[PDB]
Every structure is written in C-alpha cells, then in structure tokens.
C-alpha atoms as a PDB file:
ATOM      1  CA  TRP A   1      13.106 -42.140 -32.622  1.00  0.00           C
ATOM      2  CA  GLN A   2      15.482 -39.740 -32.915  1.00  0.00           C
ATOM      3  CA  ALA A   3      15.150 -36.320 -34.534  1.00  0.00           C
ATOM      4  CA  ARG A   4      14.483 -34.989 -37.761  1.00  0.00           C
ATOM      5  CA  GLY A   5      13.674 -31.306 -37.537  1.00  0.00           C
ATOM      6  CA  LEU A   6      13.198 -29.285 -34.743  1.00  0.00           C
ATOM      7  CA  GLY A   7      10.534 -30.321 -32.945  1.00  0.00           C
ATOM      8  CA  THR A   8       9.071 -33.217 -30.616  1.00  0.00           C
ATOM      9  CA  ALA A   9       5.894 -35.192 -31.106  1.00  0.00           C
ATOM     10  CA  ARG A  10       5.093 -32.970 -28.335  1.00  0.00           C
ATOM     11  CA  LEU A  11       6.703 -29.543 -30.270  1.00  0.00           C
ATOM     12  CA  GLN A  12       6.964 -28.428 -34.096  1.00  0.00           C
ATOM     13  CA  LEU A  13       9.088 -25.404 -34.102  1.00  0.00           C
ATOM     14  CA  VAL A  14       7.074 -24.691 -37.520  1.00  0.00           C
ATOM     15  CA  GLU A  15       8.106 -21.129 -38.782  1.00  0.00           C
ATOM     16  CA  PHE A  16      10.996 -19.106 -37.198  1.00  0.00           C
ATOM     17  CA  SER A  17      11.957 -15.399 -38.047  1.00  0.00           C
ATOM     18  CA  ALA A  18      13.666 -12.111 -36.700  1.00  0.00           C
ATOM     19  CA  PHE A  19      13.192  -9.271 -39.701  1.00  0.00           C
ATOM     20  CA  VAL A  20      13.330  -5.569 -40.623  1.00  0.00           C
ATOM     21  CA  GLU A  21      10.823  -4.265 -42.993  1.00  0.00           C
ATOM     22  CA  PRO A  22      11.576  -1.204 -44.604  1.00  0.00           C
ATOM     23  CA  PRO A  23      10.155   2.124 -43.625  1.00  0.00           C
ATOM     24  CA  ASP A  24       8.979   2.025 -47.439  1.00  0.00           C
ATOM     25  CA  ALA A  25       7.922  -1.263 -47.055  1.00  0.00           C
ATOM     26  CA  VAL A  26       3.948   0.855 -45.998  1.00  0.00           C
ATOM     27  CA  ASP A  27       5.084   1.950 -50.020  1.00  0.00           C
ATOM     28  CA  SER A  28       6.328  -1.282 -51.593  1.00  0.00           C
ATOM     29  CA  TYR A  29       6.393  -3.958 -49.313  1.00  0.00           C
ATOM     30  CA  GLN A  30       9.949  -6.206 -48.408  1.00  0.00           C
ATOM     31  CA  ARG A  31      11.512  -7.722 -45.524  1.00  0.00           C
ATOM     32  CA  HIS A  32      14.914  -8.482 -45.003  1.00  0.00           C
ATOM     33  CA  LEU A  33      15.039 -11.387 -42.860  1.00  0.00           C
ATOM     34  CA  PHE A  34      18.450 -11.878 -40.943  1.00  0.00           C
ATOM     35  CA  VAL A  35      17.598 -14.950 -40.329  1.00  0.00           C
ATOM     36  CA  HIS A  36      15.093 -17.895 -40.798  1.00  0.00           C
ATOM     37  CA  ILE A  37      13.374 -21.436 -40.404  1.00  0.00           C
ATOM     38  CA  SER A  38      10.554 -23.449 -42.387  1.00  0.00           C
ATOM     39  CA  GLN A  39       9.716 -26.991 -41.403  1.00  0.00           C
ATOM     40  CA  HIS A  40       6.377 -26.442 -43.346  1.00  0.00           C
ATOM     41  CA  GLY A  41      11.360 -38.014 -45.606  1.00  0.00           C
ATOM     42  CA  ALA A  42      15.201 -36.305 -44.377  1.00  0.00           C
ATOM     43  CA  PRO A  43      17.142 -38.023 -42.093  1.00  0.00           C
ATOM     44  CA  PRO A  44      18.440 -38.216 -38.098  1.00  0.00           C
ATOM     45  CA  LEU A  45      20.086 -34.575 -37.282  1.00  0.00           C
ATOM     46  CA  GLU A  46      24.272 -34.710 -37.007  1.00  0.00           C
ATOM     47  CA  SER A  47      24.474 -34.598 -32.537  1.00  0.00           C
ATOM     48  CA  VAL A  48      26.554 -32.030 -30.507  1.00  0.00           C
ATOM     49  CA  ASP A  49      27.899 -33.156 -27.358  1.00  0.00           C
ATOM     50  CA  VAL A  50      26.002 -30.353 -24.663  1.00  0.00           C
ATOM     51  CA  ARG A  51      29.037 -30.344 -22.536  1.00  0.00           C
ATOM     52  CA  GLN A  52      31.249 -28.556 -25.666  1.00  0.00           C
ATOM     53  CA  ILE A  53      28.745 -25.804 -25.163  1.00  0.00           C
ATOM     54  CA  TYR A  54      27.364 -25.774 -21.739  1.00  0.00           C
ATOM     55  CA  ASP A  55      30.487 -22.167 -20.820  1.00  0.00           C
ATOM     56  CA  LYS A  56      27.931 -20.188 -23.732  1.00  0.00           C
ATOM     57  CA  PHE A  57      24.964 -19.655 -21.311  1.00  0.00           C
ATOM     58  CA  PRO A  58      24.312 -18.994 -18.428  1.00  0.00           C
ATOM     59  CA  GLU A  59      24.786 -21.203 -15.017  1.00  0.00           C
ATOM     60  CA  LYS A  60      23.073 -21.370 -11.284  1.00  0.00           C
ATOM     61  CA  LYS A  61      20.212 -21.347 -12.896  1.00  0.00           C
ATOM     62  CA  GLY A  62      18.202 -21.397 -16.042  1.00  0.00           C
ATOM     63  CA  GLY A  63      21.798 -22.620 -17.351  1.00  0.00           C
ATOM     64  CA  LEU A  64      22.517 -25.040 -19.411  1.00  0.00           C
ATOM     65  CA  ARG A  65      23.351 -27.602 -17.810  1.00  0.00           C
ATOM     66  CA  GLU A  66      20.770 -27.188 -15.439  1.00  0.00           C
ATOM     67  CA  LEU A  67      17.377 -27.497 -17.428  1.00  0.00           C
ATOM     68  CA  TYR A  68      19.513 -31.128 -19.049  1.00  0.00           C
ATOM     69  CA  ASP A  69      20.059 -32.624 -15.574  1.00  0.00           C
ATOM     70  CA  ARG A  70      15.635 -31.148 -16.176  1.00  0.00           C
ATOM     71  CA  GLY A  71      14.931 -32.608 -19.150  1.00  0.00           C
ATOM     72  CA  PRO A  72      13.513 -34.397 -21.264  1.00  0.00           C
ATOM     73  CA  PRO A  73      17.082 -35.037 -23.352  1.00  0.00           C
ATOM     74  CA  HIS A  74      15.338 -34.970 -26.931  1.00  0.00           C
ATOM     75  CA  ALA A  75      14.604 -32.127 -26.298  1.00  0.00           C
ATOM     76  CA  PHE A  76      17.127 -29.791 -26.901  1.00  0.00           C
ATOM     77  CA  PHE A  77      18.704 -28.276 -29.755  1.00  0.00           C
ATOM     78  CA  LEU A  78      21.926 -26.291 -30.684  1.00  0.00           C
ATOM     79  CA  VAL A  79      20.783 -23.971 -33.934  1.00  0.00           C
ATOM     80  CA  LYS A  80      23.964 -22.514 -36.214  1.00  0.00           C
ATOM     81  CA  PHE A  81      23.008 -19.702 -38.018  1.00  0.00           C
ATOM     82  CA  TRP A  82      24.771 -18.014 -40.970  1.00  0.00           C
ATOM     83  CA  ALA A  83      22.670 -14.311 -40.220  1.00  0.00           C
ATOM     84  CA  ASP A  84      22.475 -12.238 -43.459  1.00  0.00           C
ATOM     85  CA  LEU A  85      23.810  -8.569 -41.783  1.00  0.00           C
ATOM     86  CA  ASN A  86      22.985  -7.196 -45.547  1.00  0.00           C
ATOM     87  CA  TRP A  87      20.107  -4.579 -45.783  1.00  0.00           C
ATOM     88  CA  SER A  88      16.931   3.397 -40.931  1.00  0.00           C
ATOM     89  CA  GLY A  89      14.239   4.331 -38.566  1.00  0.00           C
ATOM     90  CA  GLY A  90      12.402   0.244 -39.459  1.00  0.00           C
ATOM     91  CA  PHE A  91      10.079  -3.055 -37.679  1.00  0.00           C
ATOM     92  CA  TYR A  92      13.091  -4.563 -36.981  1.00  0.00           C
ATOM     93  CA  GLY A  93      11.299  -8.429 -35.443  1.00  0.00           C
ATOM     94  CA  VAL A  94      10.874 -11.629 -34.652  1.00  0.00           C
ATOM     95  CA  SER A  95       8.136 -14.376 -35.797  1.00  0.00           C
ATOM     96  CA  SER A  96       7.731 -18.027 -34.128  1.00  0.00           C
ATOM     97  CA  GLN A  97       4.788 -20.453 -35.419  1.00  0.00           C
ATOM     98  CA  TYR A  98       4.988 -23.353 -33.545  1.00  0.00           C
ATOM     99  CA  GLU A  99       2.219 -26.710 -33.002  1.00  0.00           C
ATOM    100  CA  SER A 100       1.293 -29.980 -31.171  1.00  0.00           C
ATOM    101  CA  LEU A 101      -1.648 -32.176 -30.964  1.00  0.00           C
ATOM    102  CA  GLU A 102      -2.470 -30.808 -27.321  1.00  0.00           C
ATOM    103  CA  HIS A 103      -3.631 -27.666 -26.360  1.00  0.00           C
ATOM    104  CA  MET A 104      -1.305 -25.847 -23.510  1.00  0.00           C
ATOM    105  CA  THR A 105       0.163 -22.544 -22.994  1.00  0.00           C
ATOM    106  CA  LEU A 106       3.209 -21.785 -23.752  1.00  0.00           C
ATOM    107  CA  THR A 107       5.623 -19.819 -21.951  1.00  0.00           C
ATOM    108  CA  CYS A 108       8.555 -18.922 -24.101  1.00  0.00           C
ATOM    109  CA  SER A 109      11.200 -16.719 -22.282  1.00  0.00           C
ATOM    110  CA  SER A 110      13.969 -15.638 -25.295  1.00  0.00           C
ATOM    111  CA  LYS A 111      17.677 -15.124 -23.163  1.00  0.00           C
ATOM    112  CA  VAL A 112      19.965 -12.754 -25.554  1.00  0.00           C
ATOM    113  CA  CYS A 113      23.566 -14.321 -23.842  1.00  0.00           C
ATOM    114  CA  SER A 114      27.108 -11.993 -23.818  1.00  0.00           C
ATOM    115  CA  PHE A 115      30.374 -13.721 -23.065  1.00  0.00           C
ATOM    116  CA  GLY A 116      27.564 -16.514 -21.998  1.00  0.00           C
ATOM    117  CA  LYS A 117      25.642 -13.788 -19.577  1.00  0.00           C
ATOM    118  CA  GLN A 118      22.413 -13.483 -19.424  1.00  0.00           C
ATOM    119  CA  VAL A 119      22.471  -9.941 -21.061  1.00  0.00           C
ATOM    120  CA  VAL A 120      18.476  -9.268 -22.178  1.00  0.00           C
ATOM    121  CA  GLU A 121      14.866 -11.345 -21.394  1.00  0.00           C
ATOM    122  CA  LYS A 122      11.753 -11.857 -23.387  1.00  0.00           C
ATOM    123  CA  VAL A 123       8.870 -13.737 -21.969  1.00  0.00           C
ATOM    124  CA  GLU A 124       5.728 -14.783 -23.471  1.00  0.00           C
ATOM    125  CA  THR A 125       2.643 -16.401 -23.225  1.00  0.00           C
ATOM    126  CA  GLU A 126       0.616 -18.033 -26.289  1.00  0.00           C
ATOM    127  CA  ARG A 127      -2.707 -20.087 -25.391  1.00  0.00           C
ATOM    128  CA  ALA A 128      -3.387 -21.756 -28.247  1.00  0.00           C
ATOM    129  CA  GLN A 129      -5.706 -21.616 -31.155  1.00  0.00           C
ATOM    130  CA  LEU A 130      -7.512 -24.755 -32.689  1.00  0.00           C
ATOM    131  CA  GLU A 131      -6.967 -25.748 -36.372  1.00  0.00           C
ATOM    132  CA  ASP A 132      -7.722 -28.980 -38.825  1.00  0.00           C
ATOM    133  CA  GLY A 133      -7.309 -31.220 -35.421  1.00  0.00           C
ATOM    134  CA  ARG A 134      -3.849 -29.965 -34.558  1.00  0.00           C
ATOM    135  CA  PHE A 135      -3.529 -27.255 -32.304  1.00  0.00           C
ATOM    136  CA  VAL A 136      -1.263 -23.590 -33.022  1.00  0.00           C
ATOM    137  CA  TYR A 137       1.162 -21.568 -31.443  1.00  0.00           C
ATOM    138  CA  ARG A 138       2.094 -17.576 -33.635  1.00  0.00           C
ATOM    139  CA  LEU A 139       3.814 -15.211 -31.876  1.00  0.00           C
ATOM    140  CA  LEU A 140       4.152 -13.164 -34.732  1.00  0.00           C
ATOM    141  CA  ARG A 141       5.677  -9.862 -34.858  1.00  0.00           C
ATOM    142  CA  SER A 142       6.865  -9.561 -32.296  1.00  0.00           C
ATOM    143  CA  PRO A 143       8.990  -6.491 -31.762  1.00  0.00           C
ATOM    144  CA  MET A 144      12.140  -7.213 -31.379  1.00  0.00           C
ATOM    145  CA  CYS A 145      13.662  -5.772 -28.256  1.00  0.00           C
ATOM    146  CA  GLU A 146      16.352  -2.634 -28.311  1.00  0.00           C
ATOM    147  CA  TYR A 147      19.438  -5.076 -26.800  1.00  0.00           C
ATOM    148  CA  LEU A 148      19.809  -6.498 -30.763  1.00  0.00           C
ATOM    149  CA  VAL A 149      18.273  -3.905 -33.016  1.00  0.00           C
ATOM    150  CA  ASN A 150      21.231  -1.607 -31.765  1.00  0.00           C
ATOM    151  CA  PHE A 151      23.544  -4.626 -31.401  1.00  0.00           C
ATOM    152  CA  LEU A 152      22.480  -4.754 -35.201  1.00  0.00           C
ATOM    153  CA  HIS A 153      23.406  -1.625 -35.728  1.00  0.00           C
ATOM    154  CA  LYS A 154      26.681  -2.204 -33.875  1.00  0.00           C
ATOM    155  CA  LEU A 155      27.785  -5.293 -36.161  1.00  0.00           C
ATOM    156  CA  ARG A 156      26.716  -4.741 -39.377  1.00  0.00           C
ATOM    157  CA  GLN A 157      29.061  -1.811 -39.883  1.00  0.00           C
ATOM    158  CA  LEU A 158      32.086  -3.780 -38.557  1.00  0.00           C
ATOM    159  CA  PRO A 159      35.533  -3.209 -41.197  1.00  0.00           C
ATOM    160  CA  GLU A 160      35.059  -7.230 -41.195  1.00  0.00           C
ATOM    161  CA  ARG A 161      32.838 -10.151 -41.056  1.00  0.00           C
ATOM    162  CA  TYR A 162      36.109 -11.828 -39.188  1.00  0.00           C
ATOM    163  CA  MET A 163      35.060  -9.178 -36.576  1.00  0.00           C
ATOM    164  CA  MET A 164      31.801  -9.682 -36.711  1.00  0.00           C
ATOM    165  CA  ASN A 165      32.483 -13.682 -36.344  1.00  0.00           C
ATOM    166  CA  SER A 166      34.741 -12.557 -33.392  1.00  0.00           C
ATOM    167  CA  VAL A 167      32.097 -10.793 -32.123  1.00  0.00           C
ATOM    168  CA  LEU A 168      29.164 -12.993 -32.668  1.00  0.00           C
ATOM    169  CA  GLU A 169      31.898 -16.057 -31.032  1.00  0.00           C
ATOM    170  CA  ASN A 170      30.897 -14.321 -27.638  1.00  0.00           C
ATOM    171  CA  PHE A 171      26.615 -13.700 -28.766  1.00  0.00           C
ATOM    172  CA  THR A 172      24.357 -16.846 -27.623  1.00  0.00           C
ATOM    173  CA  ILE A 173      20.383 -17.243 -27.261  1.00  0.00           C
ATOM    174  CA  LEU A 174      18.864 -19.093 -25.880  1.00  0.00           C
ATOM    175  CA  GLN A 175      16.073 -20.517 -25.848  1.00  0.00           C
ATOM    176  CA  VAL A 176      13.350 -22.286 -23.012  1.00  0.00           C
ATOM    177  CA  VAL A 177       9.671 -22.762 -23.802  1.00  0.00           C
ATOM    178  CA  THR A 178       7.414 -24.721 -20.948  1.00  0.00           C
ATOM    179  CA  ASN A 179       3.759 -25.943 -20.802  1.00  0.00           C
ATOM    180  CA  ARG A 180       2.376 -22.996 -18.276  1.00  0.00           C
ATOM    181  CA  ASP A 181       0.236 -25.268 -16.097  1.00  0.00           C
ATOM    182  CA  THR A 182       2.466 -28.329 -16.069  1.00  0.00           C
ATOM    183  CA  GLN A 183       6.433 -26.384 -15.662  1.00  0.00           C
ATOM    184  CA  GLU A 184       8.104 -28.928 -18.269  1.00  0.00           C
ATOM    185  CA  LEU A 185      10.081 -28.045 -20.636  1.00  0.00           C
ATOM    186  CA  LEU A 186       8.484 -28.430 -23.946  1.00  0.00           C
ATOM    187  CA  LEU A 187      11.633 -27.395 -26.144  1.00  0.00           C
ATOM    188  CA  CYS A 188      15.252 -25.831 -25.486  1.00  0.00           C
ATOM    189  CA  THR A 189      16.629 -24.444 -28.264  1.00  0.00           C
ATOM    190  CA  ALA A 190      20.958 -23.019 -28.171  1.00  0.00           C
ATOM    191  CA  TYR A 191      21.610 -20.150 -30.559  1.00  0.00           C
ATOM    192  CA  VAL A 192      25.171 -19.859 -31.798  1.00  0.00           C
ATOM    193  CA  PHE A 193      25.853 -17.543 -35.128  1.00  0.00           C
ATOM    194  CA  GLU A 194      28.251 -16.225 -37.891  1.00  0.00           C
ATOM    195  CA  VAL A 195      27.824 -13.967 -39.909  1.00  0.00           C
ATOM    196  CA  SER A 196      26.415 -15.605 -43.783  1.00  0.00           C
ATOM    197  CA  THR A 197      28.239 -13.151 -47.127  1.00  0.00           C
ATOM    198  CA  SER A 198      25.361 -11.634 -48.749  1.00  0.00           C
ATOM    199  CA  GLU A 199      25.228 -13.863 -51.858  1.00  0.00           C
ATOM    200  CA  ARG A 200      24.751 -16.529 -49.799  1.00  0.00           C
ATOM    201  CA  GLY A 201      21.541 -14.849 -47.831  1.00  0.00           C
ATOM    202  CA  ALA A 202      20.577 -16.933 -44.471  1.00  0.00           C
ATOM    203  CA  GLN A 203      21.224 -20.445 -43.761  1.00  0.00           C
ATOM    204  CA  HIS A 204      20.580 -22.706 -41.191  1.00  0.00           C
ATOM    205  CA  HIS A 205      22.232 -25.727 -39.528  1.00  0.00           C
ATOM    206  CA  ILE A 206      19.929 -28.048 -36.715  1.00  0.00           C
ATOM    207  CA  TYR A 207      21.103 -30.159 -34.086  1.00  0.00           C
ATOM    208  CA  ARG A 208      20.372 -33.115 -31.167  1.00  0.00           C
ATOM    209  CA  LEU A 209      22.214 -31.699 -28.060  1.00  0.00           C
ATOM    210  CA  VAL A 210      23.187 -34.967 -26.150  1.00  0.00           C
ATOM    211  CA  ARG A 211      25.029 -36.545 -23.349  1.00  0.00           C
END
C-alpha cells in the first residue's frame, strides 16, 4: 500500500529535470543537468517525519503543516538532491512529466524558499493529453525563473563546497500539484539540496513524508 517511487495511483512523476543548454548547443547539442529524476520490482521508499522539515517551508497557508493536515497523507514526498553545479547566457530550463489513469487539468505550483520563506513562485496549468489508455501531462522546457538562474550563477562561484552546502542548507523548493477543477492535492514534493562533486553528477533520494 506504501509508495515505491514518487507518485500515487492518481498521478505518477515520469521525469523531472533542471538543466542549462550552452549557447553553442545550436552547433553541437549538449545539456547540463543540475538535478534529474527519471521513473521510466523495487522496495518501499524510506520515510521521514514531516514535522522535522516544517521550519524549512512557509507557514500560515500553502505551508507544509496546513497542506499535510489537508491531505491526503500518501501524496507527500521529500526529495534530497545532490545538485551538479559544474558546467554564459545559455537557456536555463525545467521539464516535468506526469501520468494518470484519469483525465484532469493539473495546477503545478513551485515555491522557491529562503530560510523557509517564499521568495518566488511559479504556477502552471496543464490539460491531460490521452495517449495509449493513460493521460500524460507535459510541462517541458519551462524557462527557469531569473531568481534560480542568478542563484545558480552565484552558488557555482563560491570558493568551497562546504559553503555551497551551508548556503543550500537554507534553500528549499515546495511543489504542490492539484486537480485544478476539484482543488484536491495530487502530489506534494519538498526538495532539499546539497552539491554533488562533479565526478559524481546529479543524484537524488526520495522519501515518503509521514506523521
């Protein structure tokens, strides 16, 4: 009954990535992945108690505690990213793909938070496209908001990766996917971050948020 990947029976994440294509990508295509989840016979995901990360996201409303209280509890995930920050006016982008058995319009809200305070927010809607019995939701090549692009440019220039990790310690992203018509929550993902080491590329670990 417990999740094996990032999804519920109503909405599965297929693929998520944040990337930059250098200006010369036009000559020889390349992209750098800052972070990447691909879910194209596994055990249960580990659990993390949601109370321990409340103070890393906003409060009062659209905050973790109120969202979790709203439910459903099984829709809540924590993703730890080891971001690859080793890669210039190129294209900074975010691509997301989801799948369901039912036809919905999704609202996807992404709240960028600094010391648990909302700083920027992007809200996108996506109508289902029916393909092979299953519905697919494609939010591909969304331009990264200027706050994140500038954050990444500054973060990458820090002299020590322990300082990157100290800065990232206070940097979080909260994603809420709801049925736009019914306002029911489909997927809530809390993102926390560290740097990887370049020889190592982007990595991640997914947890169920429990209470």
